[PDB]
Paper text:
Langerin is a type II transmembrane protein that is composed of a cytoplasmic tail, coiled-coil neck region, and carbohydrate recognition domain (CRD). Through the coiled-coil neck region, langerin forms a trimer, which is functionally important for oligosaccharide binding.
The resolution was improved to 6.4 Å, which clearly visualized the alpha helices and enabled us to generate a model based on the previously reported crystal structure of the langerin trimer. We then performed a two-body refinement to visualize the spatial relationship between the two opposing langerin trimers. The interaction between the two CRDs appears to be maintained by docking the loops of two langerin molecules into each other’s lateral cleft, which constitutes the secondary carbohydrate-binding site. The interaction between the two CRDs is flexible because the first eigenvector of the multi-body analysis represents an approximately 30° tilting motion with the loop as the fulcrum. In contrast, the internalization of the pseudovirus was significantly inhibited by the ARGK mutation.
Residue numbers in the entry:
A (entry chain E), B (entry chain F), C (entry chain D), D (entry chain A), E (entry chain B), F (entry chain C): 146 to 325
The structure:
Amino acid sequence: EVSTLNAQIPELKSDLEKASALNTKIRALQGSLENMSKLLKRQNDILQVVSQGWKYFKGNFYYFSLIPKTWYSAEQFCVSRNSHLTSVTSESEQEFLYKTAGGLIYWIGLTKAGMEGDWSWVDDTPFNKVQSARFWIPGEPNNAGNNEHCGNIKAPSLQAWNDAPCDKTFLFICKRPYVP
Amino acid sequence: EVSTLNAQIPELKSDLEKASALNTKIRALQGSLENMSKLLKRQNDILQVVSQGWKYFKGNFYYFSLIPKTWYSAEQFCVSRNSHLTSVTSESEQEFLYKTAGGLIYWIGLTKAGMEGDWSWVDDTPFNKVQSARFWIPGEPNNAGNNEHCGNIKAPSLQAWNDAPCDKTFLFICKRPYVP
Amino acid sequence: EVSTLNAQIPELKSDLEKASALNTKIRALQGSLENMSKLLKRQNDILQVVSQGWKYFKGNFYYFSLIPKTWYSAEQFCVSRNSHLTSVTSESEQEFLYKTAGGLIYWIGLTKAGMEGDWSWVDDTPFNKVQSARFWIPGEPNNAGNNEHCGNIKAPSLQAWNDAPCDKTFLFICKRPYVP
Amino acid sequence: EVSTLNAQIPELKSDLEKASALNTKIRALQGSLENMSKLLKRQNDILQVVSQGWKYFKGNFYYFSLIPKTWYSAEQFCVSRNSHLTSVTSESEQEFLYKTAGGLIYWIGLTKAGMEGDWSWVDDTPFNKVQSARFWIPGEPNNAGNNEHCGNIKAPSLQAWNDAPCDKTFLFICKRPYVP
Amino acid sequence: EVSTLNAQIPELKSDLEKASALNTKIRALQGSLENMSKLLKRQNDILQVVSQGWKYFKGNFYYFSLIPKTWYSAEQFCVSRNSHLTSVTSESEQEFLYKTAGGLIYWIGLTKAGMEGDWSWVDDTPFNKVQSARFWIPGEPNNAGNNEHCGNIKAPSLQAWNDAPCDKTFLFICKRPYVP
Amino acid sequence: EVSTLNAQIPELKSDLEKASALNTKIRALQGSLENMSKLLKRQNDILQVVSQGWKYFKGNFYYFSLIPKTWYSAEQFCVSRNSHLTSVTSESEQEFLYKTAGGLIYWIGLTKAGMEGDWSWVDDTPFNKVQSARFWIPGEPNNAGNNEHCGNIKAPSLQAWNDAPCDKTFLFICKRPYVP
């Protein structure tokens, strides 16, 4: 009866760490498969809008228009595309916008509003004077002829924003935030 | 010997139920892994065609041409691209076509046939008059000048189809179904 | 005690074989999950460049320019985009280039060097005379006016290369290899 | 009869020439007398308002208030005195205003208005950016707290204008043009 | 002798007409110069008192004190300045007084006398109840505490007179008539 | 010929007599008009300085400060106004100063100089101690605390001068002579 005990008790160990290891593997595998499922569904959601002629950058779909429209008409078209004239909130966003622009001028959300005519984004994004000055073309805004109250990206460089009358047609970047 | 049995028999229940759980987890993890492998290979199949200047929608690849050509010349080019002039079979197809068109005009598979000029699709897609009724521009088809026997999408709206002579150049949407 | 042995020894076979099966599962699953993780990260690396207006083919990103520039100006722009004028090294590359070109003309890395004007690639790619002859338009190179010392793809066919002076403006295909 | 002729003809010369001199005297003395008449009327008109505690400068009466009022209330009091918060249209105007101020702060016609919040004069005097540039205290306007939309003379120097909220009580310079 | 007579008679007539006209000039010019000399003398008389910090109105000199005094002390100071506390005999005088006051309160010649306490002027000016009725502040005189027996100009309006005990200090308007 | 002579002789006599009278009146009128023109020029010169809040007395312009300053700071301000701290050269000037002061305190040009500290005027006016003694407040100068080396006018009387330390802030009378 000694040999059977010296066989059973190590069986007790072996199956206890066996069950413990199986539990650890099941929990870790469940977590990892849930994470990869989220990753794949997010990627699939990414793919479709980009496949329909839209660009993507930092959680925003940007449609670089094939047809030119005026600042407010461009905003209307972007709204019809459930979007707005692109509002730049960072260095990287401006960089991507003027790089994908390929040298083309795109109306953006910049417009003079308020009692002081301060600049603002059409999509109600806050206008950071300090940050915006770095994105503005040198000498701009100058309000040439006192009629330059809308902004557009012209230069393929960080300082791409020029002020100009809202009334004239341009290509435009329709911006709508990514949502899962 | 009683303690040995009271140790052996619960070991029987434990290892039996745990091997059953092993069977369950093996089968579930397997089915999920071939499922995700199929999803991965399908998305890989999807991505390359889009990466080469093509658009995709509901299992069909649509090329919105950068060069305008006539109706039958566009059909020839699409055939050379293993495709055809896009035939519209659903609300979603027409919507996607005119939205990705971005206001541009694209030849489609609409063409008259026979002595009475019944409309039909070039890619042998059946043409349902009642179903295709609301896809036509109002007043169209009118066969203006009695020479309007091919269809093209102009308006960024559901009523975008217009009949017009087949002999003039326009942009075109080459359509070939996605095949894995 | 005989029944105890006849019950516990098969427990030995069962637990050893199931531990071996668990080992097989762990190793195979670990290898497969590492492989699919690598595939996922490579796919993520691929997708963003194409999502920003670029094309992709066999580990090389090709930007088909929206703005035309001369041979050396196009090379400068491509370098600014961390790339070069595309050098064609295979049948597949030439085919993809003239197919995604959509009938458009693009400057490539072809250039003459030295007093004898031996042809070569700008990106230091070796120039295969035998292979390149199959890619050159018939009658080309001809050095029309003794001034045609660069190369561009015009025809949507295998024999797409025509020689031309380096100083004339054309669209261009910026080429940079895919790096993980 | 010779002597009477030689006496009477020079009588003709003398009385004719002195009648001419009489005409010259009449015209000159007249012109001078009504000229000094208008001058005397103008000085009598000038003296009366000055005698009533008002100051005078280049055809404008400026009442340097003995009681402080807010910008809008100061304008109300000035209007009640058939005047307005003083505008500044010249170097001499600003100089006289801050010199007669004697170091005291006086509300002036400066106020932000219009879609761009541009500065303007309460008395409807046109406001020139370039002209009024040097009349502002250095660093002003700064719109401290984004609430400084009226102007007052503080410094006993050319750069006397500081922007401030219109709601603060200050001495004020009532301005009304001299009218004959 | 005929010609000399036909020259002499017009000589006499012209000499007589010229002499009469010169008499007209002499008399008219003498009268005008004497009148303007008197006016200039009066202007010189007027200007000197005003130049010494005094105000002037319709033949009276009014000193608006910079230091407050009690009613009787103010009267003593005015007497020392060869004047008296100002008495108001017309609407224009009251208007000038309160307008030059600029909202400030000034002791005036109002004082009660006799066992019934009838009001009167300190400078022996007759007191018109009917006229003074419209110069008192509405509700005044009320003789608050039965101790209000002196008058001061308070309001920036015609009804500026307020009654108060004579023992408190106010600014004061010393009044002395203009005499050539 | 008798009658014509008895008419000619009175003609000559009257013409000569009234010609002499015209000469006399011309000279007298010219002198009077030149004198009154000079007087009017002087009056126009006088009026402007007084019109800007300044006082005048016997060829000197005195500014009674609305803001107080220390003795040396008052002198600096007076110099900046092209003037100096007022010096007294006559009894009438002292009378005018303390009467226009209206009981207020004003710094004057009295200051000690040299190792014996003899008194003198800041504007280099000679010190008439014989006349100055009649203008000092009784008991003054006393040099209280051996630190009283400047002069101030406080008392509304001829004896208005008091010695006092130069470092404290009083009102001041800026004095500058009238020059045509």
